[PDB]
Amino acid sequence: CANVPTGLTGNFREDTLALISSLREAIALPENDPNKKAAQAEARKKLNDFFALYRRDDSLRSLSSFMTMQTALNSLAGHYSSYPNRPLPEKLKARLEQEFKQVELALDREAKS
Amino acid sequence: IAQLTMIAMIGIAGPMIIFLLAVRRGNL
């Protein structure tokens, strides 16, 4: 029962894929725009409101998809807290990309299995 | 200093309250 009205739904895969594409495009955004500062506000709040709503379930810890995307959100957030007003290396953007691809593959391969 | 006076006063306020009552017969 009872999900937030911030975009989410009860079927994990859907709002997950949505959140993934949203923050992929968000970190793909140039830093010479003054909306980037604004972007980080909604990035941070949606990170928190997904993780805290979906951490609760015990089942999906026996999957690989959740466990890998968890690390991804964690590295993003950790750099956020580490330098608030300074963008991050694109080494970590490549790393973030890597595990988003493998999470997406894992969601799609667990959908049939 | 004027910051030891209260700790000194406070510390001696105990038996005053009862000695003033033994005179003013609010207890025997």
Add this chain to the structure above:
Amino acid sequence: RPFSDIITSVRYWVIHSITIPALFIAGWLFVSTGLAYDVFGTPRPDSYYAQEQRSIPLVTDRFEAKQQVETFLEQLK
């Protein structure tokens, strides 16, 4: 005779409220003038060790015992 009655009898007070402070002060001076250390042979706390020695004074013979202490004390151990 209950102890309470002789303790608050005037005969007790007149002598004892003079002798009690004398004993307390005699003890206080036995320590404060440095004499307590010299009577019981207990070392001062800057002097358990000699300058030269880093080893403890230890007795090793019973009939030349006081001789060994007398020696250890001259070298300021």
Add this chain to the structure above:
Amino acid sequence: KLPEAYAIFDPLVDVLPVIPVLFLALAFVWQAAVGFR
């Protein structure tokens, strides 16, 4: 520390936490005052 327009009260708070126990301590002297029951 405390604010420093309340800072003179550094020694005051070094004794506040113990006035509760002194209330028990005052109780007994009230019984000593009335010579007991």
Add this chain to the structure above:
Amino acid sequence: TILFQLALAALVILSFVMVIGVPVAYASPQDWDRSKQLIFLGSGLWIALVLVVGVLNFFV
């Protein structure tokens, strides 16, 4: 400022005379009628005084 220190000092010496004042005012059976008025106005003063030091806390 001067007025804020005046308030905190005044409050603490006021509470300190009042802590002896209020129990004996109740305890004494002789002339309870006369004591009730002063403890009333003193209580009023004491809460007023904590308000003004609290409201001048935000400027100091």
Add this chain to the structure above:
Amino acid sequence: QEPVSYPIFTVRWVAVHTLAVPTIFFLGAIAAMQFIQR
């Protein structure tokens, strides 16, 4: 038991004075030891 007249030396008298006088000397010793700086 011991007569109320109580001459200066009494079995009770020595008993309470061989446990009074050294203790007031010794407590005065220990108290002085508290203010010795290490």
Add this chain to the structure above:
Amino acid sequence: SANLWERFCNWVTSTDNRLYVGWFGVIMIPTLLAATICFVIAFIAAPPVDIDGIREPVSGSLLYGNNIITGAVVPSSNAIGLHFYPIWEAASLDEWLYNGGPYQLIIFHFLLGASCYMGRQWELSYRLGMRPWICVAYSAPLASAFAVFLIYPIGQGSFSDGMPLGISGTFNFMIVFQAEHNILMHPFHQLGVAGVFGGALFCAMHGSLVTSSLIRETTETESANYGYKFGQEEETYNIVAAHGYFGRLIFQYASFNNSRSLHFFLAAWPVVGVWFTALGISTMAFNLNGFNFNHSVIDAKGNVINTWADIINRANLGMEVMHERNAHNFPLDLA
């Protein structure tokens, strides 16, 4: 028949039974009987129990070469921790014996049964209409057993930290415990020591005084029961050499002049004592250790002077390093 339930309730609550079997007793016999049957089988013939989870075991059984003094029921493996580990959670019988299953069976049934013993006490004393407080005096060994078998393990994080059920096993537990927590300087353990020496001492005093004063005792007996006049003769004088020693120490400390304070005080002493140490063992379960002094005496040259506390710290260190196979890189530890 009268329909077996009515017969059954009379049977249980009868006090004409040779051994009372109350409603606490109805839980007590199966639990205690299970505990003891498992214990004697395990003590004799339980194969060695791995206790550090590295595949190196310890033999506690008698058919594997122990005598009465070296044998034990070895506690549960360190891998298990505080998990509840019944036999249907294992997958074979041999691996349940290899991980130290039975020990948990024994202690769980033993604590249930020993609690029901206290209940059974209270119930019988209620039936005879007497002041029911034999049970609160028993609550001291019972409190102690909770502290040693259940609580100190929970506090440390494992049943591998429990007391073995054996003679030399207890000695091992005591020595290791002193090594890690310094129990001797814990004031509560000191209250415990005081309590049991004082109990033993007051037992000898009371017994000696009473058997010197008794003269002859007789109570009328019938061919089926006992009488109603309990005769008793005693001595009823004492001197003023047990008036400066016994009279004006006891009338002043008991807070009564009455004889009824003797037997109240006799039981109060060791019970309070064993509660205090039972409490103390639990506080070290959360690692609040006792006093220890290192470097409390230094001279004005800046050299350290030793004292007895430091010798005990050395001996404790000696025990404590010997207990630690696990690593040689350990700086500050437990739990």
Add this chain to the structure above:
Amino acid sequence: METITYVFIFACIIALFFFAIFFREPPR
């Protein structure tokens, strides 16, 4: 050798328990 001796002595204690409960001396 040793263990038989141990369990035999044990067995006669517990037998002695049984004897002390159900065959005590009638005190008359």
Add this chain to the structure above:
Amino acid sequence: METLKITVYIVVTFFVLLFVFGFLSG
């Protein structure tokens, strides 16, 4: 090994239910 699980549950509930019905049986 599961028959063991059910036999302990069963025998245990039997003893516990007669003890609780006992205190209400006066």
Add this chain to the structure above:
Amino acid sequence: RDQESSGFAWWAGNARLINLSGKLLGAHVAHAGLIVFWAGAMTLFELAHFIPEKPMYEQGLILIPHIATLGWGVGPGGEVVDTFPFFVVGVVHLISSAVLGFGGVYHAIRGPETLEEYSSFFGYDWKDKNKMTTILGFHLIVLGIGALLLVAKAMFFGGLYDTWAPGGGDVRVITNPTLDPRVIFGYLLKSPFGGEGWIVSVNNLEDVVGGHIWIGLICIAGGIWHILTTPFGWARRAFIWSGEAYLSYSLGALSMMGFIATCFVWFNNTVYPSEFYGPTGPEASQAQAMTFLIRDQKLGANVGSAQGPTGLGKYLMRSPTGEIIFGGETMRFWDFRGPWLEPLRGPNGLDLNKIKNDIQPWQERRAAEYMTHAPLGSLNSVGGVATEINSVNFVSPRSWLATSHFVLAFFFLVGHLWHAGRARAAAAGFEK
């Protein structure tokens, strides 16, 4: 009256207040003033020795951590961002104690002895069922409202300090707890033994807030019931109905709440964050192993591809369920979960690859910092084991909390038996 001849002494002077209802109200309300006074004084005293850049557990803070969890005075990262809110609560309690104390000294030196022949609405007796059920009903409704204050603080006045946010933990506003009772009442069907835990295994603030919603409303519901409903027949035959008995019944509950309070403070980590209290029991050890694994792997050779002189594991090993966990004396711990550890687990547990290249700064510094100050304590507040020298000082505030509340719980078990026997002896009577 005011001298013996009621059956008690001067150490049972308190027992003279059983029938003196106004004086008894007086004693309680004055005592309540003392509790608030201590809160205010201790908090100010603790602030006065607090350094606002050194954590809240190597110094000996025990009550400002309680403020911090309500989101007052901490910003993201678990740090102090001004000490002024602590001051506000400190003096607020301190001044409210004055007026508590004023009403106390009034009702205990001047007020009416008997409140039954004043009014019948604050009158009571210990044998009149209707009054006492109404007092109980009022205390139930006000407690239920009090519980709903924490759902209010968590929703509207800026959330609570969430320990499970992914930055390292920070304040967050709860905008959705779970009211589906299958979670809330589900925790109470867990076994207390390891691998789960009883209700000391809860680990997100949503269950906390939602459970508070349920308990608040059910407590107000029962409070509405117990005014409009007098005790039933079976009830009135089950208990004794005397005035000291109610105190006994209360003491029996506070005994149990103590033991489970110790379990709460000692094990749980979500309603007792580890950045305001010290490291927990298990997590200290876990961090120590993890820091060592990193250290000896980045300099030296790997140790999670190499078995040691143990014959099972060296740094990583398999659980009794076949899961990769830390090895050593820390394989007794594998149920642990913490905000710094979970990003190093996979579905099977620890994966050494993740330990190599997914380390964030706060994880590793927090772990090495936790490792240094493992929970040890002593009565003289000397660090380490009670073999170590004065080179390190520390006691964990959790050790103190746990031990004191456990000791007092035992003593309340004694006192419960004492007042129980007193009640039973009085009510039976035997010659009555």
